[PDB]
Design an enzyme around this catalytic site. Structure first.
Site, PDB file in Angstrom:
ATOM      1  N   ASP A   1      35.854 -40.103-126.514  1.00 16.45           N
ATOM      2  CA  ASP A   1      35.006 -40.189-127.693  1.00 16.45           C
ATOM      3  C   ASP A   1      33.620 -39.575-127.406  1.00 16.45           C
ATOM      4  O   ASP A   1      32.871 -40.160-126.620  1.00 16.45           O
ATOM      5  CB  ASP A   1      34.844 -41.664-128.024  1.00 16.45           C
ATOM      6  CG  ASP A   1      34.089 -41.911-129.313  1.00 16.45           C
ATOM      7  OD1 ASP A   1      33.664 -40.958-129.980  1.00 16.45           O
ATOM      8  OD2 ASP A   1      33.975 -43.106-129.650  1.00 16.45           O
TER       9      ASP A   1
ATOM     10  N   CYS B   1      41.136 -41.682-136.501  1.00 17.47           N
ATOM     11  CA  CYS B   1      40.276 -42.306-135.497  1.00 17.47           C
ATOM     12  C   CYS B   1      39.486 -43.406-136.193  1.00 17.47           C
ATOM     13  O   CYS B   1      40.054 -44.107-137.031  1.00 17.47           O
ATOM     14  CB  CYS B   1      39.505 -41.252-134.757  1.00 17.47           C
ATOM     15  SG  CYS B   1      38.916 -41.838-133.144  1.00 17.47           S
TER      16      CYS B   1
ATOM     17  N   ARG C   1      36.045 -36.779-133.883  1.00 16.65           N
ATOM     18  CA  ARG C   1      37.314 -36.279-133.347  1.00 16.65           C
ATOM     19  C   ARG C   1      38.323 -36.018-134.462  1.00 16.65           C
ATOM     20  O   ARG C   1      39.048 -35.021-134.427  1.00 16.65           O
ATOM     21  CB  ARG C   1      37.959 -37.252-132.361  1.00 16.65           C
ATOM     22  CG  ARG C   1      37.244 -37.245-131.014  1.00 16.65           C
ATOM     23  CD  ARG C   1      37.809 -38.291-130.108  1.00 16.65           C
ATOM     24  NE  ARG C   1      37.416 -39.623-130.554  1.00 16.65           N
ATOM     25  CZ  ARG C   1      37.763 -40.761-129.964  1.00 16.65           C
ATOM     26  NH1 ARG C   1      38.514 -40.747-128.885  1.00 16.65           N
ATOM     27  NH2 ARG C   1      37.349 -41.931-130.450  1.00 16.65           N
TER      28      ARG C   1
END
Lengths: 151, 151
Positions: free
Chosen positions: A122, A16, A22
């Site tokens: 997100d 990411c 994440r």
């Protein structure tokens, strides 16, 4: 033993942006399922050296997953080449990975490939509820990857 | 009732090149599973007016699927816009669809998205064995799409 697209999968790289939210969560969910495989994560513009986000860590711990001793790292072309499968959270990130290494598009997939919604939002700097929701999505997505790779 | 990526799927368009082989087979496998849905196929450079390939038809019939009254058609930008999900056989074909309509990349997926191998080979002008192998792959891929869309 894991396979995808007519090849063995020995290593998985979860990518990411910051490599603090994440991506370490996704990494550790996969590692919990795949203790003998090489699983890592990296960021497209990482907070190099950073530990996992505090809220991400709290939520993961509640579900029995540890994000301890995470050290954020910048994605390099070499990491892309060396990984057998590269997993990103959002479609737009595929092109970003391919800017770092143009030859890996074929093995760059969504983390959420095996779930109906495909993309994963997100939660960074959002509410506790956003982190909990995203964790559940990542947990489901990760399990569905494990099932697909091993069936 | 079918869903994907946070939206209803009412229509599915299966796309390949000639619209005489993989694509009508894929279309009719989906139609057999989804009698109430709008399912069609089209070709990136179609043999406009052509019926399904003879060998494709023979193989499908052996497995209880009819390719009768297929009429090959050219893919248009309008067809792309109107379809809720566009399925292609090979990764390279995604960019080809996007040249006809640049706005549909988000809903253009592999027919084999839900199977380990992802891509589906082209049997056109190959042996009977190639057509049989490809049929089985398409049958599995189609069932896995139906499962994913409806679970």
């Amino acid at each position: 033993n894991l396979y995808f697209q007519g090849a063995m999968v020995n290593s998985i790289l979860v990518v990411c942006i910051g490599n603090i939210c994440r991506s370490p969560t996704g990494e550790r969910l996969l590692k919990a399922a795949l203790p003998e495989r090489k699983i890592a994560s990296a960021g497209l513009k990482a907070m190099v050296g950073g530990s996992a986000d505090e809220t991400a860590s709290i939520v993961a711990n509640e579900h029995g997953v540890s994000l301890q001793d995470h050290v954020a790292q910048q994605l390099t072309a070499d990491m892309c080449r060396d990984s057998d499968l590269i997993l990103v959270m959002e479609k737009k990130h595929i092109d970003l990975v391919c800017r770092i290494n143009p030859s890996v598009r074929g093995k760059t997939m969504l983390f959420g490939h095996w779930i109906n919604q495909q993309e994963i939002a997100d939660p960074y700097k959002k509410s506790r509820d956003a982190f909990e929701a995203v964790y559940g999505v990542l947990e489901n997505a990760a399990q569905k990857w494990v099932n697909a790779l091993s069936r």
